[PDB]
Amino acid sequence: FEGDLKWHHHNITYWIQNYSEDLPRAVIDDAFARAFALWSAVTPLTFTRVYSRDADIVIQFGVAEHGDGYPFDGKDGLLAHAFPPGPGIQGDAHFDDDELWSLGKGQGYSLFLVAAHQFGHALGLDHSSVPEALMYPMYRFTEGPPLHKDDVNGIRHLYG
Amino acid sequence: FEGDLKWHHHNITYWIQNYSEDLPRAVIDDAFARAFALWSAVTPLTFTRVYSRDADIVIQFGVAEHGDGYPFDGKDGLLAHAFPPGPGIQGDAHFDDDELWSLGKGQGYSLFLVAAHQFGHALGLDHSSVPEALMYPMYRFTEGPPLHKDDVNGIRHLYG
C-alpha cells in the first residue's frame, strides 16, 4: 500500500460479524482460521478470534451496498474486498453474499482461497505481478498450497 | 511502463491478422476502428490499417499457448492482453477467442470495449485505480462514453 501500511502490533484479532447461509457456521469458522494460519506461519504476527467490535480485522458477509459506500455488484465479478491495516474499517474484509461460498471441490468460490487473498490486503499486501501467486487479482481455483515466493517476499518486506 | 514506454512515431499502423467466427469480419474491423477512434482524438496519433506483419500493432485471436508465451485460460478469466509500445511483439494485442465476442447488451464481451482498453495498453497505458474508467482492469458493459478523465490524463501524460 501507499506508504507501506502495516500493523504495529502482533496479536491481530478478528471478529466475525455474521455468517453466510451457504456453509454451516462452523465450516466458515474453520475456513477463516486456516486462512490466518497461512499468514501466522510466515509472519511475526498471531491471529486471535474474538467477540468484540474493537477487533482489528472485522469480518462480514454482505450483498450490494453494505456500509463503506463501496457496494458489491451481484453474481460474479467483485468477490470480496479488504481494507489496509489501520483503525476502524481499515483491516476489515467483506464477502459478497451474492457469490455462492463453499470449500474446495465445491461449485462455488472457495471461501478459504478468497479469505486467504483478503487477509493479505489486511496485512498490507497489494496485488502481485506473478500470475501464480495468491495476491494475483484473478481467482483460479487451486488444490495446491496457496502461498508462493512472491506472497512471502511481500510479507517479509513488511514484517521482517 | 515503469520506464514509461510509448511510441516514437505518430502514425501508428495496424494489422488484423485473423478473425474470430463470433462476429462478421466487417463488424470486427469496424469494432476495431471504433476503438482506435477513442485514442485518435485525444492523442497526436493516427491509426492506419495495413495488411502487413510489419504493422506496429498486430491484432490476433488465440487460445491457450499462442506465440507470446502468455497463454490464455479457456472461457472467462483472461479476456485479452497487450504489450507496451516497442518493436515486434510489443504493441501487439491478443484476444482470447475462447470468449464469445459480441456487441451491445446481451451475451459476450463487447469486442469494442475490450479492444479500447486493449489499444490503450498498446500505447503504453497501465491499469486504472478508478472503478469507472476504461483502463479499470474489470469489465462492466456500458452504453456510455468509455473514456474518462483518468484515461485522458493517462495518454496526455505519455504523448500530450
Ligand SMILES: CC(C)[C@H](C(=O)NO)N(CCNC(=O)c1cccc(C(=O)NCCN([C@@H](C(=O)NO)C(C)C)S(=O)(=O)c2ccc(-c3ccccc3)cc2)c1)S(=O)(=O)c1ccc(-c2ccccc2)cc1
Ligand atoms: C477489492 C477488489 C479490487 C478485488 C480484490 O482484489 N480484493 O482483494 N477484486 C479484484 C479486481 N482486480 C484488481 O484489483 C486488479 C488490480 C491490479 C491489476 C489487475 C489486473 O491485471 N487484472 C487482470 C486483467 N486481465 C488482463 C488485462 O487487463 N489486459 O489489458 C491482464 C492479465 C493483462 S484480463 O484479460 O482478465 C482483462 C480485464 C478487464 C478488461 C477491460 C476493462 C475495462 C473495459 C474493457 C475491458 C480487459 C482485460 C487487477 S475482486 O474481483 O473482488 C477479487 C479477484 C480475485 C481474488 C483472489 C485472487 C487469488 C486467489 C483467490 C482470490 C480476490 C478478489
Ligand SMILES: [Ca+2]
Ligand atoms: Ca460480485
Ligand SMILES: [Ca+2]
Ligand atoms: Ca478494522
Ligand SMILES: [Ca+2]
Ligand atoms: Ca452467498
Ligand SMILES: [Ca+2]
Ligand atoms: Ca508490434
Ligand SMILES: [Ca+2]
Ligand atoms: Ca478466457
Ligand SMILES: [Ca+2]
Ligand atoms: Ca469464440
Ligand SMILES: [Zn+2]
Ligand atoms: Zn465493504
Ligand SMILES: [Zn+2]
Ligand atoms: Zn485483491
Ligand SMILES: [Zn+2]
Ligand atoms: Zn498473447
Ligand SMILES: [Zn+2]
Ligand atoms: Zn488491462
